[PDB]
Design a protein around this ligand. Structure first.
Ligand SMILES: Cc1ncc(COP(=O)(O)O)c(CNCC(=O)O)c1O
Ligand SMILES: Cc1ncc(COP(=O)(O)O)c(CNCC(=O)O)c1O
Ligand SMILES: Cc1ncc(COP(=O)(O)O)c(CNCC(=O)O)c1O
Ligand SMILES: Cc1ncc(COP(=O)(O)O)c(CNCC(=O)O)c1O
Lengths: 396, 396, 396, 396
């Protein structure tokens, strides 16, 4: 019995999971319990000093959460996993585990906004400095390293613009200089990109997105070597963020992840079609999509990703006002944040998430007035395309 | 329609809750969603800049979690609430919201061990110093204050020993010197003690314990003024710990809390009886219980608590080995950590949670070799007493 | 280890439940699985012929549902239990298990309306006849028996009017004449009335009401001898109604039932007060409540019930229109059906559930124009009373 | 806004669902409530007489269950839907709605065993007769019709052997003679076969199988004309079986069904490969699979099914003992009943479900000693094939 051995689809379905030993129940039971019962005083002391296995209390670990963690470790080719309340909590639990006052981080600039603020306004208040670079240009990463640099942090593709970061090249710079690479692998799952295999040390995910895939879990997951994971758990989560995952949330995300392979295939085949349509459209000025040949890092993309992903950005003819009109005129696509659910979602960070954010903040930070982000769900592409077509046509 | 007005039991049942407006559904629906849908671009921008109500995304807020938060705010007489993944996350989200490098905390020594470690080994790594005092002696609290002291932190009664801390007296010292009081109100719920009414600024709870009351939720809750809560939410939780609560966990804890008044009454009436039995027992050397007249702070207890609580500590004749035997000989009482569930739980932090923790660490830190902690559940007291009687008799 | 031995409160908390054997998890795990895994072909054949224990498939049985079933069997002093999708399904699964075409039932007239219709319009279509009697007059029960009478069916107290049925006296008539007694014990739980101890053969409950107690489960439970239960399960449920219970619903109802003893105590102490207030009110013409001395079967009530229950009926000065006004004027009490939740619920079967049901159907069937039914929740009685007082005053 | 209009994948994702109107919550909320609250007495009377919309009480209907019901109605091209506790309860609720004593049913012989027993031993006890025919030979269906025949009942493909039934041809015989056709569409979902479009009147499903697809829900669904559905609901379910569905079970099955299109595609592409491998294997004597050209009804299959399905039966060299060995020697495939989960499941109704069922009962009833049924999950086919190959090789 070793699940690391089977093909990747078999692993998505089976790894971390086994029928319940005392009943045969095939679905992983929801161990919705806060506490666990020891059968002896000495056994309670054994477990508590970390001297024996296994369970003590849900903040510390849980058999439902354990399966999910073993699964994701397997899919990412990591040694171990640690689930968390949110993807944000996967990132902060990681970096607050790795960092004390006086340390330095080097970060991609082109990351998720809530990650940006943690690093911008919160990290330095604990005396941990962060320097921001265009991670697409790995020399910038080298140029910002310092003796106190403990961690280099990246997302690929980069949330807003779908630019890429060469992981292997970034792995070697960070390592040469004594730092760990931490890669947020959220936009791809491990079905699409495996940063650990490229030399990264830690992978984090918002399991909220594709891994759960169903738009009803907020959660995160950390994957890395056993020694780091143990600290992330017994200190970072146990003591610092306390962002542990509900066993219900674990069990939903195990449910969600069974269909990861086939949902990724369909997300990505759908998005390719939609992107090609967007490219040919006279009212669309630019399309950002790793699967379009016109993508500046297309070849990089072809080597480190099995699939170009379910996310498309694009700019519409006429900026802010046209984008507003278009986003108000979709009938199928839903106006919401988050991504990686089975429904097609659309966001206009210009008329929307960044509207009373002064025009000059915006542009510096990769966002245009016409920029629309699409999360492509599992609908028939024709239906999405016709909805897009209608609303674009409406708006220009 | 104002629920702050009704009696305390009516509030436990009703406050924060109303039948679902589009259906009439009386149970608060589980909004197990990650995302929310805006009906306009401009409405999405309104909400996002904090310019209009209400929902955007579950890490930020959720209608299920909102009810629980409004309930607990009401019961504690606070302005607002913020739920969290764990009670630990309620504490760290609070103090990491209030503290940057260079700040000082003054803390009770006699607190929950995981809180102790956060303050001992983790807080100072962000350049935040913590000084530990016997909070039972409020002069010690005064004596340790500094110009950079931002927060005073206490538990009452104090987790291990059930010693008390005079909240009103501690409120005034902390305030006189420009600091906030933060009180962990976990061992009491607000049905028993309301620290905010005594002058505390922030109350935190592990809702895992009594508030949920059913041993199947890990969760926490923060209560305080709107201005602090907004920061705890939009920065501390959104950005730093990311310890948000599953809407399922919220909905269980709303379920759990309906019966808070009657479960507290029964916990406390049961525990009083058991404590009086323990007092009269020739093989029990000491009993720690706020409702026993021999309690050193009995009068303090009588003024700041409506009820003496569901927790008893006691020492058994013969130390470590007798306590081990006793704890291995109970048949009804369950050997487990946590407290405040409907089953009677018993822990022996000597033979157990602190066994390969060298004898000298232990004693300094209030723990004796014979010390047993009982969480008294909802069983018939006679049954618990006879189980206790049998096992004590076994062990000496 | 035998839970039939402890006091009744200890049993409510513990019976049917034990910590999970492979993990120690104290909360009963939710085995939300459809299927179970056998470790051998021969073991799969063993279980399937009923030749060995235990689990095969959730329609047939489940470890979560099993606990609830063992609990309720214990509390009712029955041999075994069988959970169901609804209380209606507990009744039909019972009687369709016990009855073929040509059989006869004798039933109380004063039962739940949906039960009435099953017996009125549905039972006879399968060639099973039902005769309706005032079960309050046990001679009427004797007078309607026939050689083909297989079952006598009753509710006590009787849903609408809170009249009672003498179980022991009805047990002996039914038995003398070769029939089983089936008692719907829903309005009481087993904490209040134990019909099996009085000589009844089968007890059914809508666990939707008090047993779950939290207004978020639809469910039912059957309790009786092992031999009948096995048929109810392997034929009646497996083959006929197929009304099996979700393991989630089981697990909520196990959660709900932990607090049964204390919720019943509070329901009943609250209702007593409210009933006495209603009695003294000049605008209330009649009050129906087993705990009022003016109850016609008060002594019967005193002998077969530990407590008079949480349900009050009463008539208001001025009939239909006054009752409508009153029910529209309550502010705390919620206008809804069902009963036995933690919120106080109020229904006016006159202006409401039976309004376009012609005035003459109604009166025959125990209902008056002014009749209001209150399900008394866990609010402060004073608050309920003042709400009642206000609205009554409004309405007359 | 009309979802009947979009392509079939768009419908799987969207139909029956819309963001929550008072919050925007994109996931359909779990309305885990027993009861609903009316805002007026008169509105409570309106709804109750069926005079206005909408909700009254979960046994009767629920907004979570409603979505699932509207979805499945849409996917099957029916007018309405009604969810149930089990697939068995979808069938009995249907036929007990349509049948009184004296009526006749004509049924396929080759159906699910639990359906068989209901019809064999239970239906006739209510004075409802059933005649069993080889539904593969539609003349046999004609030959058994009677003046009192109300319903013809079929499964296609037929659970054990995967024989087919020509729906259109059977529709016309049943209709010509004044009967309704009822088709159990469980082995296909509506993604694969739409019996209603072929002239059937009622479709039932065990949603336990493919529709939920995740092996953690027991549930069923009825689809048909509004007039029949209303009776199935307000009488058959409300009064007779009472097999209503938990809103949690509904919400899981809505979750499960989002991925129906892609899970069916993968189930069926996987199974085709495995079947072709099984065909070429010298130790496999017979393979039953609608997608193999050697299937006797291959052309029928090609016309009424979009896809040949995820189920394979086959016989192994050497009968009972070889099948036992093989089924005990699989390492990936799980030994369990049920089908249509994401894991590959295998059953040997010879050494197993029918072992102490005397050899002569068996053979009559289509089962051979060597017969193995495979439910093909979402693993890599190569992995399943190699596991099959190994175990077959083991066993012969
Ligand atoms: C790359 C990335 N990393 C982390 C997160 C944080 O995940 P949680 O919400 O679970 O804490 C997100 C969410 N980004 C939301 C999207 O841009 O709309 C993300 O896109
Ligand atoms: C007083 C107090 N505060 C905070 C916590 C932390 O709660 P969470 O486990 O939800 O993170 C605990 C738990 N103390 C466990 C008991 O001493 O066994 C506590 O007792
Ligand atoms: C006595 C009694 N028996 C059975 C039922 C049926 O229970 P389910 O709804 O779980 O199927 C009820 C519900 N009676 C609802 C009340 O009169 O408002 C009842 O009161
Ligand atoms: C065709 C068919 N119809 C109805 C059912 C009944 O479904 P429920 O278990 O939800 O009540 C089944 C289950 N048949 C199980 C399989 O043969 O292993 C079935 O295969």
């Amino acid at each position: 019995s070793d699940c690391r051995t089977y093909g990747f689809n078999t692993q998505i379905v089976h790894a971390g999971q086994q029928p319940d030993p005392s009943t045969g129940a095939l679905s992983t039971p929801i161990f919705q319990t806060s506490t666990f019962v020891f059968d002896s005083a000495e056994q309670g002391a054994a477990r508590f000093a970390l001297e024996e296995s296994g369970y003590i209390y849900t903040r510390l670990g849980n058999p439902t959460t354990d399966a999910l963690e073993k699964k994701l470790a397997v899919l990412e080719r990591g040694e171990a996993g640690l689930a968390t309340a949110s993807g944000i909590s996967a990132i902060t639990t990681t970096l607050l585990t790795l960092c004390q006052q006086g340390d330095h981080i080097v970060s991609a600039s082109a990351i998720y906004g809530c990650t940006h603020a943690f690093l911008s306004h919160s990290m330095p208040k604990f005396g941990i400095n962060v320097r921001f670079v265009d991670a697409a240009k790995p020399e910038e990463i080298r140029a910002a390293m310092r003796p106190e640099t403990k961690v280099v942090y990246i997302e690929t593709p980069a949330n807003p613009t779908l630019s890429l970061v060469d992981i292997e090249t970034v792995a070697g710079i960070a390592h040469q200089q004594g730092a760990l690479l931490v890669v947020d692998n959220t936009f791809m799952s491990p079905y699409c990109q495996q940063p650990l295999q490229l030399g990264a040390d830690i992978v984090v995910h918002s399991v909220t997105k594709y891994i759960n895939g169903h738009g009803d879990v907020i959660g995160g997951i950390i994957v890395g070597k056993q020694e780091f994971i143990d600290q992330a758990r017994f200190v970072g989560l146990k003591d610092i963020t306390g962002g542990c995952m509900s066993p219900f949330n674990a069990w939903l995300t195990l449910r969600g992840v069974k269909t990861l392979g086939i949902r990724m295939e369909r997300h990505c085949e759908n998005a390719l079609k939609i992107a090609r349509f967007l490219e040919g459209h006279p009212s669309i000025t630019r399309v950002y999509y790793p699967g379009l040949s016109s993508h500046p890092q297309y070849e990089l993309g072809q080597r480190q990703m099995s699939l170009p992903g379910g996310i498309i950005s694009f700019e519409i003819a006429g900026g802010l006002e046209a984008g507003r009109r278009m986003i108000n005129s979709v009938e199928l696509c839903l106006l919401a944040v988050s991504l990686g659910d089975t429904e097609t979602l659309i966001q206009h960070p210009a008329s929307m998430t960044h509207s009373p954010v002064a025009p000059e903040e915006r542009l510096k930070a990769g966002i245009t007035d016409g920029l629309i982000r699409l999360s492509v769900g599992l609908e028939d592409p024709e239906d999405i395309i016709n909805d897009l077509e209608h609303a674009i046509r409406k708006a220009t």
